[PDB]
Amino acid sequence: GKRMDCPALPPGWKKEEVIRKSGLSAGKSDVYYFSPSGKKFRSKPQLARYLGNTVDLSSFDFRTGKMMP
DNA sequence: GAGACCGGTAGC
DNA sequence: GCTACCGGTCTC
């Protein structure tokens, strides 16, 4: 799966949260982003390198997908 | 203490 | 060869 749109980002970006199914950290979740091209990102720096100066992710909270002032 | 970040591998 | 997945440290 369920990639929801992410309005805090430019049009076409989707956010997906995945619950860990096994292991000691089973239950925890990993958050992933998807560019219009379909590229998978898993960290705010990855995302910053790919968008460059189009959007400031300093106030951007990676887990929720919202701009936190 | 919490979680962001990313490395290494198990499973395809 | 690729990649999803969980472990583990680093940063706060």
Residue A31 and residue A40 in contact, taking contact as beta carbons nearer than 8 Å: no
Residue A50 and residue A57 in contact, taking contact as beta carbons nearer than 8 Å: no
d(CA A6, CA A28): 21
Write down the experimental method used for this entry: X-ray
Non-local CB neighbours of A4 within 8 Å, separated by 6+ positions: A14, A15, A16
Q: Give the other-Cβ count within 10 Å of A17's Cβ.
A: 14
Resolution number, Å: 2.7
In CATH, the number for domain A1-69 is: 3.30.890.10
Residue type, A10: P
Nucleotides of C under 7 A from a protein CB: 4-8
Determine whether the distance from the CB of A46 to the nearest atom of strand B is below 7 Å. yes
d(CA A26, CA A28): 6
Determine whether the distance from the CB of A68 to the nearest atom of strand C is below 7 Å. no
Interatomic CA–C1' length for residue A31 and nucleotide B9, angstroms: 20
Closest CA to A62 of A38, A30, A21, A40: A30
Q: Give the other-Cβ count within 10 Å of A66's Cβ.
A: 15
Residue A39 and residue A31 in contact, taking contact as beta carbons nearer than 8 Å: no
